[PDB]
Write a protein that binds this ligand. Structure first.
Ligand SMILES: Cc1ccc(OS(=O)(=O)O)cc1
Ligand SMILES: Cc1ccc(OS(=O)(=O)O)cc1
Ligand SMILES: Cc1ccc(OS(=O)(=O)O)cc1
Length: 285
Protein backbone atom coordinates (compact mmCIF):
# COMPACT_ATOMS: atom_id res chain seq x y z
CA UNK A 1 0.00 0.00 0.00
CA UNK A 2 3.04 2.33 0.38
CA UNK A 3 3.15 3.08 -3.39
CA UNK A 4 -0.59 3.67 -3.83
CA UNK A 5 -2.39 7.01 -3.26
CA UNK A 6 -4.75 6.13 -0.40
CA UNK A 7 -6.72 8.62 1.72
CA UNK A 8 -8.14 7.51 5.10
CA UNK A 9 -11.66 9.14 5.24
CA UNK A 10 -12.83 7.85 8.64
CA UNK A 11 -13.31 4.70 10.68
CA UNK A 12 -13.38 1.68 8.39
CA UNK A 13 -13.17 3.72 5.18
CA UNK A 14 -10.61 4.87 2.65
CA UNK A 15 -10.33 6.07 -0.92
CA UNK A 16 -7.89 4.53 -3.44
CA UNK A 17 -6.99 7.13 -6.05
CA UNK A 18 -5.98 6.22 -9.60
CA UNK A 19 -5.45 8.33 -12.71
CA UNK A 20 -5.14 7.85 -16.46
CA UNK A 21 -4.11 10.36 -19.10
CA UNK A 22 -4.98 9.44 -22.69
CA UNK A 23 -4.56 11.87 -25.62
CA UNK A 24 -5.18 11.79 -29.36
CA UNK A 25 -3.38 14.27 -31.63
CA UNK A 26 -5.77 13.25 -34.50
CA UNK A 27 -8.95 14.01 -32.52
CA UNK A 28 -7.41 16.98 -30.64
CA UNK A 29 -8.41 15.61 -27.23
CA UNK A 30 -6.80 14.89 -23.92
CA UNK A 31 -8.69 12.82 -21.30
CA UNK A 32 -7.20 13.43 -17.79
CA UNK A 33 -9.38 11.11 -15.73
CA UNK A 34 -9.41 10.45 -11.99
CA UNK A 35 -10.87 7.20 -10.65
CA UNK A 36 -11.43 7.07 -6.92
CA UNK A 37 -12.45 3.79 -5.30
CA UNK A 38 -14.55 4.24 -2.16
CA UNK A 39 -13.70 1.41 0.21
CA UNK A 40 -16.13 1.39 3.14
CA UNK A 41 -16.65 -1.53 5.51
CA UNK A 42 -20.17 -0.14 6.26
CA UNK A 43 -21.29 0.07 2.59
CA UNK A 44 -22.31 -3.23 0.86
CA UNK A 45 -21.34 -1.98 -2.61
CA UNK A 46 -18.16 -0.90 -4.37
CA UNK A 47 -18.18 2.66 -5.81
CA UNK A 48 -15.86 4.35 -8.27
CA UNK A 49 -16.05 8.13 -8.51
CA UNK A 50 -14.91 9.09 -12.00
CA UNK A 51 -13.90 12.71 -12.61
CA UNK A 52 -13.41 13.62 -16.24
CA UNK A 53 -11.05 16.54 -17.02
CA UNK A 54 -8.68 17.37 -19.90
CA UNK A 55 -9.10 19.31 -23.10
CA UNK A 56 -11.13 19.21 -26.27
CA UNK A 57 -9.66 21.36 -29.07
CA UNK A 58 -12.22 23.65 -30.68
CA UNK A 59 -10.88 22.66 -34.13
CA UNK A 60 -11.98 26.14 -35.32
CA UNK A 61 -10.59 26.85 -38.79
CA UNK A 62 -10.86 29.36 -41.62
CA UNK A 63 -10.45 28.28 -45.22
CA UNK A 64 -10.88 29.13 -48.85
CA UNK A 65 -13.58 27.30 -50.81
CA UNK A 66 -12.26 25.61 -53.98
CA UNK A 67 -14.12 25.52 -57.30
CA UNK A 68 -15.60 27.82 -59.96
CA UNK A 69 -18.15 30.22 -58.48
CA UNK A 70 -16.68 29.93 -54.94
CA UNK A 71 -13.73 32.40 -55.32
CA UNK A 72 -15.35 34.98 -52.98
CA UNK A 73 -16.74 32.33 -50.55
CA UNK A 74 -14.88 31.51 -47.33
CA UNK A 75 -15.54 28.88 -44.67
CA UNK A 76 -15.39 28.97 -40.88
CA UNK A 77 -15.70 25.62 -39.07
CA UNK A 78 -16.34 25.97 -35.33
CA UNK A 79 -17.74 23.93 -32.43
CA UNK A 80 -21.45 24.27 -31.77
CA UNK A 81 -21.26 21.67 -28.99
CA UNK A 82 -18.75 19.77 -26.90
CA UNK A 83 -19.71 16.16 -26.08
CA UNK A 84 -18.69 14.35 -22.86
CA UNK A 85 -20.09 10.91 -22.05
CA UNK A 86 -19.46 7.76 -20.06
CA UNK A 87 -21.20 4.55 -21.06
CA UNK A 88 -21.10 0.92 -19.93
CA UNK A 89 -22.83 -2.28 -21.17
CA UNK A 90 -21.84 -4.61 -18.29
CA UNK A 91 -24.79 -5.81 -16.21
CA UNK A 92 -22.51 -5.64 -13.16
CA UNK A 93 -22.20 -1.85 -13.12
CA UNK A 94 -24.63 1.05 -12.92
CA UNK A 95 -24.34 4.83 -12.63
CA UNK A 96 -25.69 6.20 -9.34
CA UNK A 97 -24.93 9.90 -9.64
CA UNK A 98 -23.69 12.49 -12.05
CA UNK A 99 -22.58 16.11 -11.96
CA UNK A 100 -23.79 18.47 -13.25
CA UNK A 101 -27.21 16.76 -12.78
CA UNK A 102 -29.33 19.59 -14.24
CA UNK A 103 -29.04 22.16 -17.00
CA UNK A 104 -26.65 24.96 -16.04
CA UNK A 105 -26.33 28.24 -17.94
CA UNK A 106 -23.88 30.25 -15.80
CA UNK A 107 -20.46 31.18 -17.26
CA UNK A 108 -18.81 29.33 -14.37
CA UNK A 109 -19.83 25.88 -13.19
CA UNK A 110 -18.63 24.77 -9.74
CA UNK A 111 -20.27 21.83 -7.97
CA UNK A 112 -19.45 19.22 -5.30
CA UNK A 113 -20.14 15.49 -4.83
CA UNK A 114 -19.93 14.52 -1.16
CA UNK A 115 -19.71 11.06 0.39
CA UNK A 116 -20.52 10.03 3.96
CA UNK A 117 -19.72 6.62 5.43
CA UNK A 118 -22.50 4.08 4.94
CA UNK A 119 -23.04 4.64 1.18
CA UNK A 120 -24.35 8.19 1.28
CA UNK A 121 -23.74 10.48 -1.67
CA UNK A 122 -24.95 14.06 -2.00
CA UNK A 123 -24.45 16.77 -4.61
CA UNK A 124 -24.61 20.52 -4.47
CA UNK A 125 -24.35 23.06 -7.35
CA UNK A 126 -21.75 25.06 -5.41
CA UNK A 127 -18.19 24.73 -3.95
CA UNK A 128 -17.16 25.44 -0.34
CA UNK A 129 -20.55 25.05 1.30
CA UNK A 130 -19.79 22.02 3.47
CA UNK A 131 -17.15 20.51 5.69
CA UNK A 132 -19.68 17.71 6.63
CA UNK A 133 -18.54 14.98 4.20
CA UNK A 134 -16.10 12.12 4.85
CA UNK A 135 -14.86 12.65 1.23
CA UNK A 136 -15.67 15.05 -1.56
CA UNK A 137 -14.82 15.73 -5.16
CA UNK A 138 -15.57 18.92 -7.09
CA UNK A 139 -16.05 19.96 -10.71
CA UNK A 140 -15.11 23.36 -12.10
CA UNK A 141 -15.22 24.69 -15.64
CA UNK A 142 -15.91 27.86 -17.58
CA UNK A 143 -18.30 27.85 -20.56
CA UNK A 144 -18.69 31.50 -21.64
CA UNK A 145 -21.49 31.84 -24.25
CA UNK A 146 -22.37 28.12 -23.91
CA UNK A 147 -24.78 26.16 -21.69
CA UNK A 148 -24.56 22.64 -20.23
CA UNK A 149 -27.34 20.09 -20.54
CA UNK A 150 -27.64 16.43 -19.65
CA UNK A 151 -28.57 14.97 -23.04
CA UNK A 152 -28.91 11.43 -21.80
CA UNK A 153 -28.87 9.83 -18.41
CA UNK A 154 -29.82 6.38 -17.29
CA UNK A 155 -28.36 3.54 -15.19
CA UNK A 156 -25.80 2.66 -17.90
CA UNK A 157 -24.84 5.99 -19.52
CA UNK A 158 -24.56 9.71 -18.98
CA UNK A 159 -23.95 12.30 -21.71
CA UNK A 160 -23.48 16.04 -21.35
CA UNK A 161 -23.63 18.55 -24.17
CA UNK A 162 -21.98 22.01 -23.69
CA UNK A 163 -23.75 23.92 -26.42
CA UNK A 164 -23.44 27.35 -28.04
CA UNK A 165 -26.10 29.70 -26.68
CA UNK A 166 -25.60 33.50 -26.90
CA UNK A 167 -22.56 35.60 -27.83
CA UNK A 168 -21.39 39.18 -27.23
CA UNK A 169 -20.76 40.85 -30.63
CA UNK A 170 -19.85 44.52 -31.53
CA UNK A 171 -23.54 44.96 -32.52
CA UNK A 172 -24.97 43.40 -29.31
CA UNK A 173 -25.93 39.87 -28.18
CA UNK A 174 -26.39 37.28 -30.95
CA UNK A 175 -28.05 33.89 -30.82
CA UNK A 176 -25.89 30.83 -31.48
CA UNK A 177 -28.31 30.16 -34.43
CA UNK A 178 -27.87 33.59 -36.08
CA UNK A 179 -26.42 32.80 -39.55
CA UNK A 180 -24.39 36.04 -39.34
CA UNK A 181 -22.65 35.04 -36.05
CA UNK A 182 -18.86 35.64 -36.50
CA UNK A 183 -19.25 37.07 -40.03
CA UNK A 184 -17.63 40.39 -40.96
CA UNK A 185 -16.76 42.39 -44.06
CA UNK A 186 -13.02 42.03 -44.73
CA UNK A 187 -10.77 42.34 -50.78
CA UNK A 188 -8.27 44.67 -49.07
CA UNK A 189 -5.98 41.72 -48.24
CA UNK A 190 -8.62 38.97 -49.09
CA UNK A 191 -7.58 36.34 -46.55
CA UNK A 192 -10.21 33.70 -45.46
CA UNK A 193 -9.46 34.72 -41.83
CA UNK A 194 -10.55 38.33 -42.54
CA UNK A 195 -14.13 37.27 -43.42
CA UNK A 196 -14.70 36.30 -39.74
CA UNK A 197 -14.52 37.91 -36.27
CA UNK A 198 -10.94 38.41 -35.04
CA UNK A 199 -9.60 36.22 -32.18
CA UNK A 200 -10.40 38.93 -29.54
CA UNK A 201 -14.15 38.71 -30.35
CA UNK A 202 -14.10 34.84 -30.14
CA UNK A 203 -14.72 33.39 -26.66
CA UNK A 204 -12.37 30.63 -25.40
CA UNK A 205 -14.74 27.75 -26.37
CA UNK A 206 -14.46 28.92 -30.03
CA UNK A 207 -10.84 30.15 -30.17
CA UNK A 208 -9.15 27.44 -28.08
CA UNK A 209 -11.36 24.65 -26.80
CA UNK A 210 -13.06 23.33 -23.71
CA UNK A 211 -11.60 22.01 -20.43
CA UNK A 212 -14.27 19.54 -19.17
CA UNK A 213 -14.89 18.83 -15.52
CA UNK A 214 -17.66 16.20 -15.00
CA UNK A 215 -18.32 13.43 -12.50
CA UNK A 216 -20.25 10.16 -12.46
CA UNK A 217 -20.10 7.37 -9.87
CA UNK A 218 -20.11 3.71 -10.94
CA UNK A 219 -21.74 1.24 -8.52
CA UNK A 220 -20.86 -2.49 -8.35
CA UNK A 221 -22.27 -5.21 -6.07
CA UNK A 222 -19.49 -6.92 -4.09
CA UNK A 223 -19.69 -10.55 -5.17
CA UNK A 224 -20.45 -9.77 -8.82
CA UNK A 225 -17.54 -10.27 -11.32
CA UNK A 226 -14.16 -8.69 -10.70
CA UNK A 227 -14.05 -6.28 -13.61
CA UNK A 228 -16.19 -3.92 -15.68
CA UNK A 229 -15.44 -2.06 -18.88
CA UNK A 230 -16.75 1.42 -19.70
CA UNK A 231 -16.11 4.01 -22.39
CA UNK A 232 -15.45 7.72 -21.97
CA UNK A 233 -16.09 9.88 -25.03
CA UNK A 234 -14.90 13.52 -25.43
CA UNK A 235 -15.49 15.42 -28.66
CA UNK A 236 -17.38 18.05 -30.54
CA UNK A 237 -20.03 18.82 -33.14
CA UNK A 238 -18.94 21.42 -35.66
CA UNK A 239 -21.00 23.94 -37.61
CA UNK A 240 -19.92 25.66 -40.79
CA UNK A 241 -20.48 29.32 -41.54
CA UNK A 242 -20.00 30.21 -45.20
CA UNK A 243 -19.44 33.90 -46.04
CA UNK A 244 -19.61 35.17 -49.63
CA UNK A 245 -18.55 38.67 -50.68
CA UNK A 246 -20.84 40.21 -53.30
CA UNK A 247 -19.07 43.48 -54.22
CA UNK A 248 -22.44 45.18 -55.07
CA UNK A 249 -24.68 43.95 -52.12
CA UNK A 250 -22.10 43.12 -49.41
CA UNK A 251 -21.36 40.00 -47.38
CA UNK A 252 -23.85 37.10 -47.48
CA UNK A 253 -23.82 34.26 -44.92
CA UNK A 254 -25.21 30.74 -44.73
CA UNK A 255 -24.92 28.28 -41.84
CA UNK A 256 -24.68 24.51 -42.03
CA UNK A 257 -25.80 23.50 -38.55
CA UNK A 258 -24.54 20.10 -37.25
CA UNK A 259 -22.15 19.95 -40.20
CA UNK A 260 -19.80 17.42 -38.57
CA UNK A 261 -21.44 15.46 -35.71
CA UNK A 262 -19.82 13.35 -33.02
CA UNK A 263 -16.17 13.98 -33.84
CA UNK A 264 -15.27 12.17 -30.66
CA UNK A 265 -12.28 10.46 -29.10
CA UNK A 266 -13.55 7.37 -27.26
CA UNK A 267 -11.42 5.43 -24.79
CA UNK A 268 -12.37 2.06 -23.28
CA UNK A 269 -11.18 1.51 -19.69
CA UNK A 270 -11.46 -1.53 -17.43
CA UNK A 271 -11.98 -1.22 -13.66
CA UNK A 272 -10.85 -4.19 -11.53
CA UNK A 273 -12.99 -3.93 -8.37
CA UNK A 274 -10.95 -6.59 -6.56
CA UNK A 275 -7.47 -5.15 -7.17
CA UNK A 276 -8.65 -1.46 -7.25
CA UNK A 277 -6.91 -0.92 -10.60
CA UNK A 278 -7.77 0.86 -13.85
CA UNK A 279 -6.43 -0.17 -17.28
CA UNK A 280 -6.78 1.36 -20.73
CA UNK A 281 -8.23 -1.35 -23.04
CA UNK A 282 -8.60 0.44 -26.34
CA UNK A 283 -9.51 3.61 -28.13
CA UNK A 284 -10.45 4.92 -31.58
CA UNK A 285 -7.06 6.74 -32.15
C1 LIG B 1 -12.74 19.28 -41.86
C2 LIG B 1 -12.36 18.80 -40.48
C3 LIG B 1 -13.01 19.29 -39.36
C4 LIG B 1 -12.59 18.94 -38.08
C5 LIG B 1 -11.53 18.08 -37.92
O1 LIG B 1 -11.11 17.73 -36.61
S1 LIG B 1 -11.93 16.55 -35.87
O2 LIG B 1 -13.09 17.22 -35.38
O3 LIG B 1 -11.01 16.14 -34.83
O4 LIG B 1 -12.20 15.48 -36.78
C6 LIG B 1 -10.90 17.54 -39.03
C7 LIG B 1 -11.32 17.90 -40.29
C1 LIG C 1 -10.64 23.03 -46.04
C2 LIG C 1 -11.93 22.25 -46.06
C3 LIG C 1 -12.66 22.05 -44.90
C4 LIG C 1 -13.83 21.31 -44.90
C5 LIG C 1 -14.29 20.77 -46.09
O1 LIG C 1 -15.53 20.08 -46.11
S1 LIG C 1 -16.86 20.97 -46.35
O2 LIG C 1 -16.91 21.97 -45.34
O3 LIG C 1 -17.94 20.00 -46.28
O4 LIG C 1 -16.68 21.54 -47.67
C6 LIG C 1 -13.58 20.96 -47.26
C7 LIG C 1 -12.41 21.70 -47.24
C1 LIG D 1 -23.73 14.69 -26.03
C2 LIG D 1 -22.88 13.48 -26.33
C3 LIG D 1 -21.99 12.98 -25.38
C4 LIG D 1 -21.14 11.93 -25.68
C5 LIG D 1 -21.16 11.38 -26.94
O1 LIG D 1 -20.28 10.32 -27.27
S1 LIG D 1 -20.72 8.80 -26.87
O2 LIG D 1 -20.78 8.81 -25.41
O3 LIG D 1 -19.66 8.01 -27.46
O4 LIG D 1 -22.00 8.61 -27.50
C6 LIG D 1 -22.06 11.84 -27.89
C7 LIG D 1 -22.91 12.88 -27.57
Amino acid sequence: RANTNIENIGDGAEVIKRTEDVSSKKWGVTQNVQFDFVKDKKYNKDALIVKMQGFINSRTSFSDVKGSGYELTKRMIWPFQYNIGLTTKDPNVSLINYLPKNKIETTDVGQTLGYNIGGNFQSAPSIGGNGSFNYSKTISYTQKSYVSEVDKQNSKSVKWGVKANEFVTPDGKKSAHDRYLFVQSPGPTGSAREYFAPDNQLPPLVQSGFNPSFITTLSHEKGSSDTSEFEISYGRNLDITYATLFPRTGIYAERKHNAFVNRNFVVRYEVNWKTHEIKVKGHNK
